[PDB]
Amino acid sequence: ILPAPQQLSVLSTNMKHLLMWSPVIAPGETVYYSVEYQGEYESLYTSHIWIPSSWCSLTEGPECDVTDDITATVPYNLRVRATLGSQTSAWSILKHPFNRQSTILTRPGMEITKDGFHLVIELEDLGPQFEFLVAYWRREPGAEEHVKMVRSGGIPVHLETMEPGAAYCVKAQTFVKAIGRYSAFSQTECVEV
Amino acid sequence: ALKTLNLGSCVIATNLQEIRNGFSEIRGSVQAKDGNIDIRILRRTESLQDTKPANRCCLLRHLLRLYLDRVFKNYQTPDHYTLRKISSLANSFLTIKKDLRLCHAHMTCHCGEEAMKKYSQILSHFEKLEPQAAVVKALGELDILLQWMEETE
Amino acid sequence: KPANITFLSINMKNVLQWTPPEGLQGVKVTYTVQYFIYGQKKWLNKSECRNINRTYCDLSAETSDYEHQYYARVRAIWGTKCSKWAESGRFYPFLETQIGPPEVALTTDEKSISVVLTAPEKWKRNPEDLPVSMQQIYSNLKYNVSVLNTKSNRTWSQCVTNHTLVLTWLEPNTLYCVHVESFVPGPPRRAQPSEKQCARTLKD
């Protein structure tokens, strides 16, 4: 009698994965949910076994952050059931198994600073799944793109020691190695001394 | 950075880092469950880097099949946290098995006797031990396996 | 009956460590330690650790091989009443050892500070022995260099591999603080306090 959740979808942005569903609207206590998953390994090698999610074992909202769960670049199966005290609904399945390869990749955040002649950059902290390709150039007709890889986003990293001439420009994109994809570059932004 | 693995004619890109990070979370717990301190399965006379490149891909494919066929799915623990990690390791291992299978399909995963010989040896060691002790021990030996793969320049 | 057995391993100097048992006083307990080599057969004695007053034993020579794993046990002794046998966990020095800081040497100019690091040395066997760069054991050893400008509270990191780094175009009569950590990419290790050195640029 308790309806099993409908319209399951996954919302994946910068390698953070949100499992969503229509809430179950029923008179009783507060409706709680249980989400479980299985990676392609489990599907093929032990099809009848599901691993319970790391944060959605009986939680309120009609949503779930499965990020800590989808940790390999394979199709994952996700199911959710709703539960009102005694009554527990049927397991409802995601129509199309989710692969993180499809996460949406946002242009990285960027903060260019100057400690004197010293060009410095600190990128949005998108987490360990991410590396940044920073392109900086001395904005003159002859000069070329330099490229530096920056490993993480917490930190202020030294790009170059500018000379008094020209005005430097910088743009940035992400690289997620686990899925082999880049984001679009950030707006170019310039500076000088 | 990914790890570029040189397996003779077979060259694949692997996310060694992801797997090592996942395994460091459980190494100590797991290795504590393994009483047979006198038996080493991945013995070191069978290291991958010491293998002729032609034969490496074959060896590795079998080793992965070993782990996927009879280790990951059979390790028993009451600890949910642990179980999740193990699913990570296995699915990560699966992406690699998938590339090796491609190498195989393209006829670049040749199984020569240096390869079969060293695998049989490993398989033997693993078969000496009583089942659960066996899986407990091999799971606890991921650090050797991941290093064998990092070793191969 | 000792407990909290662990290795402390920085630069391949591996040291076993436990904490005293439980005896109300028993002020005289001594300790003996044996070391085992994973996958081999016999526990082994360590003579320099047969009956000692300390709660730590240097096993660097016994655990020098990169390819092996080791265990170590220790027990406490009174008369000939010995409390069981206290066993460490599987220990893998090639993956588990802390890589230590390179020593940093700052020299100055009015615009420019030169940093010269000399790579951390591996534990030396014989006092007269050939020194060994940890950068020979870990060919991919990199250093993470942090530069703080005390005048502005501004700071910025960078990774390098070259043993020598010139900081150029600096503010004069400013005091800059440099500290360097060592890192090998690979399995995560226990970090190690970077070395922290200061230098002031010369006046205009």
What is the spatial distance between Cα C161 and Cα C141, in angstroms, rounded to a whole number? 7
Experimentally, the structure was elucidated by: X-ray
Subunit contact A156:C156, Cβ cutoff 8 A: yes
The CA–CA distances, whole Å, from B56 to B49, B143, C63 equal 8, 18, 29
Return the CATH class of domain C1-98.
mainly beta
Domain's final residue, options A89, A105, A121: A105
Set of chain A residues whose Cβ sits within 8 Å of the Cβ of B92: 71-72
Q: What angle do CA B70, A100, A13 make, to 5 degrees?
A: 150
The boundaries of the domain holding residue A114 are: 106-193
Locate breaks in chain B with C to N over 2.5 A; list the residue preceding each. none
A46 touches chain B (CB under 8 A): yes
Q: Distance between alpha carbon C36 and the CA centroid of its chain, in Å?
A: 22
User: Which of B15, B73, B92 lies closest to A46 in CB terms?
Assistant: B73
Q: Are residues A100 and A120 in the same domain?
A: no
CB pair distance less than 8 Å for C41 and B150? no
H or E stretch including C186? Answer: none
Q: Please tell me the distance in Å from A29's CA to the nearest CA on chain B.
A: 28
The residue type at C1: K
Q: Which two tokens stand for residue A183?
A: 């984001």
Please state at what angle helix B113-128 crosses helix B131-139, rounded to 10 degrees. 120
Q: How many domains does chain A fold into? A: 2
A130: closest CA among A172, A177, A69, A170? Answer: A177
Distance to chain C for B147, nearest Cα, Å: 9
Residue A89 sits in a domain whose CATH number is 2.60.40.10
Q: Which residue of C has its CA nearest to A118?
A: C169
> B1-153 adopts what CATH topology?
Growth Hormone; Chain: A; (1.20.1250)
Residues A25 and A101 occupy one common structural domain: yes
A65 and A115 together in one domain? no
What residue ranges do the domains of chain C occupy? Answer: 1-98, 99-204
A94 and A8 in one domain?
yes
DSSP letter at C105 equals: E
- Rounded to whole angstroms, the Cα distance separating A192 from A160 reads 12
* C41 in contact with chain A, both atoms CB, cutoff 8 A: no
A99 and A112 share a domain? no
Residue with tokens 């060293």: B118
Domain ranges in chain B are 1-153
Domains C1-98 and C99-204 share a fold: yes
**Residues B138/B77, Cβ–Cβ less than 8 Å:** no
For chain A, say whether B14 makes contact (Cβ under 8 Å). no
Do A32 and A69 belong to one domain?
Answer: yes
Within 13 A of A166's CA, how many CA atoms are on the CB side?
A: 14
Domain final position from A105, A137, A154: A105
* Secondary structure of residue A13 in the 3-state scheme: strand
Return the closest-CA partner of residue C59 out of C24, C8, C108, C25: C8
Two tokens, residue A69: 């769960």
Dihedral sign from CA coordinates of C101, C102, C103, C106: negative
Angle between helices B80-105 and B53-70 (to 10 degrees): 140
Q: Which two tokens stand for residue A81?
A: 């059931």
Q: Do C36 and B150 touch (CB under 8 A)?
A: no
Strand partners, A16: A13
Q: Are B144 and B48 in contact (CB under 8 A)?
A: no
What is the bridge-based pairing of β-strands A131-138 and B3-7?
unpaired
Listed residues A58, A78, A105: the one ending a domain? A105
**Same domain for A114 and A129:** yes
How far apart CA C195 and CA A127 sit, in angstroms, is 27
Whether residue A185 sits in one domain with residue A117: yes
The CA-CA-CA angle for residues B26, B32, B34, to 5°, reads: 110
Choose among B22, B84, B90: nearest Cβ to A41: B90
Given this structure, which CATH class describes domain C99-204?
mainly beta
Query: Resolution of this entry in Å?
Result: 2.8
User: What distance in Å separates the CA atoms of residue C49 and residue B64, rounded to the nearest whole number?
Assistant: 42
Tokens encoding A48:
């009848």
What is the count of residue pairs from B and C with beta carbons less than 8 Å apart? 35
